[PDB]
């Protein structure tokens, strides 16, 4: 059974090949205590990783090891992988090959560092590394299409063809879940709620996942929200306080389609998807339009499928047909696609064996698995 | 002439447009006698507002109507404004327009009640609300730079590239002069001095204003103070006792650059300036670096400009040059900038007329003012 570990900026999913759901899904944070300890004999640890950090997040400084898709701290990344195998999964990687997932347009330094870290610290027998966006379409069951990969890192639009990522057609986008979370607390201060610390950032993320939604029409919804109190909903903080949000429900997710709210010159995810398609060839343009698949936790807002379809329809020519595919399992689309690829019989051919790694060195990752 | 009232968390300044200095500067405190009146010869008013309460602060419970730039008690705020117009400025508000100041990233209800009070209690012909940090740049004769304002409640960094401030790059911290005063009396107990009541709080503020200074090198200065003498200063209390403070002279201002002493996860006043600049465009970063402006009473410590320059230089790339501008009259920079704006002929069309407020109610303050 080959492990399928999908590291991510927000959450990392781990499990086994052939399963339909990840075994362990915990936040990818590494918190350290900022206060000195007074009670002796408790055996308190120095660093808390995963669910332990979230439970005790009040007295910790939560730092995300991965920011904007690049690992800014390679010492904390080893801590999370160590916690994934021994603690959450309780399986020694000595007898199980490990599958890792990259990000589109990843620097070559990260590619070799991931191979070097695991082949020595964990010494797994075999490895294969694949693109997260590529695996997103594999879970949906189609090999050709354009993936609107979004998450807590950076939004990527990768129009893969025949299971291969087009390198020139990939368009980056920094609009992600973290930006909306930071933007939500900036506009929540207008009602008198002040969330500033990193511990309270997790609280805002819970609000975004439960109450926020995408409105079909922004101008129509704005007038309705001001006139009537129907749109207001109540949320309860961990301390017992009750808060009310009236029109922030459809104003924070709207920043995806209108980045000018955050002050970014780049266009929204509706126009980036259209721009990426235009970069591809004319003949294969027909197939990509009808096989667009959303992925990641950012695209889980209610009504985002309808808003995206309507707005991309106007930009696209009237001859083109739009079919936004939004599977309900799109949160774990990256992991599920990885499990499908690992379980394949022909997948044994492109393993990176431990014996082959020593003779070739860390540079084998560039040419073997691409 | 147009009255320019700059209500502040600690002190409020009121005057006339075109003047070079505020006419009246008194503390923004409202006190009520906790003890029972025993004599009948004198008036023995219910409450005292301004410097009247400061003189009799022994027998009163001083309460600040403004906390962190938000008016917590609107009953006491009406007392202060009634005292400003009728006792200090001794003018009728019914004939002169009034210009007010509000901190950025404030609750919408804070400036909505300000419009309602002005147009219903004092019947001012016109009104306007302006950002405190924006006016601080006008007093220095600049229209392109970053303003580091710091008072009693708010310490906000507002990068202003043009006549209008950049909204997406505004950073606000709830660490200011009042927070340092509470920290100064906490570490003063280490030497055996106990200041608890609000009347004793005003004594600590005098000590902070006269003896505290920012050390260029905190680690080196702590070792120097460990050798005793050459750094202890003597202060005389209103009772008559003489107190000596050693390393507390620079420890209290050091909480600005190291907020971890107060248990706040927020970054220091030096990092929050660099972070604010990083949110702007690449082309504009060159101008903002060389046009940094300090303002407010908190930044009046001896040597804060020198210390701030060193900290920013290490964080900023060595190619860029850092020039911190510290005008001699930066205490009244907020009011002086407002005087220039009010006296401008173009500003006559930006006033909110009485008829305009009636047709739209208090909500017009959000759409017109900024």
């Amino acid at each position: 059974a080959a492990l399928v570990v999908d590291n991510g900026s927000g959450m990392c999913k781990a499990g086994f090949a052939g399963d339909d759901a990840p075994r362990a899904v915990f936040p990818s944070i590494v918190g350290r205590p900022r206060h000195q300890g007074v009670m002796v004999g408790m055996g308190q640890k120095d660093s808390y990783v995963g669910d332990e950090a979230q439970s005790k997040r009040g007295i910790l400084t939560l730092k995300y090891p991965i920011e904007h898709g690049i690992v800014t701290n390679w010492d904390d990344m080893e801590k999370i992988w160590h916690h994934t195998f021994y603690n959450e999964l309780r399986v020694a990687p000595e007898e199980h090959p490990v599958l890792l997932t990259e990000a589109p347009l990843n620097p070559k330094a990260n590619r070799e560092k991931m191979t070097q870290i695991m082949f020595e610290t964990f010494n797994t027998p075999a490895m294969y590394v694949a693109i997260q966006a590529v695996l997103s379409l594999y879970a949906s069951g189609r090999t050709t299409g354009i993936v609107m990969d979004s998450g807590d890192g950076v939004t990527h639009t990768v129009p893969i063809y025949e299971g291969y990522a087009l390198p020139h057609a990939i368009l980056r986008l920094d609009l992600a879940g973290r930006d909306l979370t930071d933007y939500l607390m900036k506009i929540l201060t207008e009602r008198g709620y002040s969330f500033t610390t990193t511990a309270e950032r997790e609280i805002v993320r819970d609000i975004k996942e439960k109450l926020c939604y995408v409105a079909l029409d922004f101008e129509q919804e704005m007038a309705t929200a001001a006139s009537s109190s129907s749109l207001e909903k109540s949320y309860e903080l961990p301390d017992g306080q009750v808060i009310t949000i009236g029109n922030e429900r459809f104003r924070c997710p709207e920043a995806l389609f209108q980045p000018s709210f955050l002050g970014m010159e780049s266009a929204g995810i509706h126009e980036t998807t259209f721009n990426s398609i235009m970069k591809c060839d004319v003949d294969i343009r027909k197939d990509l339009y009808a096989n667009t698949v959303l992925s990641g936790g950012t695209t889980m807002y209610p009504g985002i499928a309808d808003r995206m379809q309507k707005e991309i329809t106007a930009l696209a020519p009237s001859t083109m047909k739009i079919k936004i595919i939004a599977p309900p399992e799109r949160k774990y689309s990256v992991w599920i696609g990885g499990s499908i690829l690992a379980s394949l019989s022909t997948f044994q051919q492109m393993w990176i064996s431990k014996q082959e790694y020593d003779e070739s060195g860390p540079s084998i990752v560039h040419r073997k698995c691409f | 002439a147009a009255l320019v009232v700059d209500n502040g968390s600690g002190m409020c300044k009121a005057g006339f447009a075109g003047d070079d200095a505020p006419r009246a500067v008194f503390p923004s405190i409202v006190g009520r006698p906790r003890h029972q009146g025993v004599m009948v010869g004198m008036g023995q008013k219910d409450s005292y507002v301004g410097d009247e309460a400061q003189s009799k602060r022994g027998i009163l419970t001083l309460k600040y109507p403004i906390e962190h730039g938000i008016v917590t008690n609107w009953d006491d705020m009406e007392k202060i404004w009634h005292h400003t117009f009728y006792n200090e400025l001794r003018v009728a508000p019914e004939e002169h327009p009034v210009l007010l100041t509000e901190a950025p990233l404030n609750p919408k209800a804070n400036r909505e009640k300000m419009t309602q009070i002005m147009f219903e209690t004092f019947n001012t012909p016109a009104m306007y609300v302006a950002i405190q940090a924006v006016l601080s740049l006008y007093a220095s004769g600049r229209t392109t730079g970053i303003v580091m304002d710091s008072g009693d409640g708010v310490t906000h960094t507002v990068p202003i590239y043009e006549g209008y401030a950049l909204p997406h790059a505004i950073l606000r911290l709830d660490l200011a002069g009042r927070d340092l005063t509470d920290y100064l009396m906490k570490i003063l107990t280490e030497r055996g001095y106990s200041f608890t009541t609000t009347a004793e709080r005003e004594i600590v503020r005098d000590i902070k204003e006269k003896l505290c200074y920012v050390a260029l090198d905190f680690e080196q200065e702590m070792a120097t103070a460990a050798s005793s003498s050459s750094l202890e200063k003597s202060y005389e209390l209103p009772d008559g006792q003489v107190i000596t403070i050693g390393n507390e002279r620079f420890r209290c201002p050091e909480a600005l650059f190291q907020p971890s002493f107060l248990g706040m996860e927020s970054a220091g006043i030096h990092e929050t300036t660099f972070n604010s600049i990083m949110k702007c465009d690449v082309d504009i970063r060159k101008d903002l670096y060389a046009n940094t402006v300090l303002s407010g009473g908190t930044t009046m410590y001896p040597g804060i400009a020198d210390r701030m320059q060193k900290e920013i230089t290490a964080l900023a790339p060595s190619t860029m040059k850092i020039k911190i501008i510290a005008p001699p009259e930066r205490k009244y920079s907020v009011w002086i900038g407002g005087s220039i704006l009010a006296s401008l002929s173009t500003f006559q069309q930006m006033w909110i007329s009485k008829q305009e407020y009636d047709e739209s109610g208090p909500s017009i303050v959000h759409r017109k003012c900024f």
């Binding site: 009602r191 008198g192 709620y193 969330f195 | 962190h68 730039g69 938000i70």
Partner: peptide, 7 residues
């Protein structure tokens, strides 16, 4: 404030 701080 309402939720957070004291103001």
């Amino acid at each position: 404030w309402x939720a957070x701080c004291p103001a």
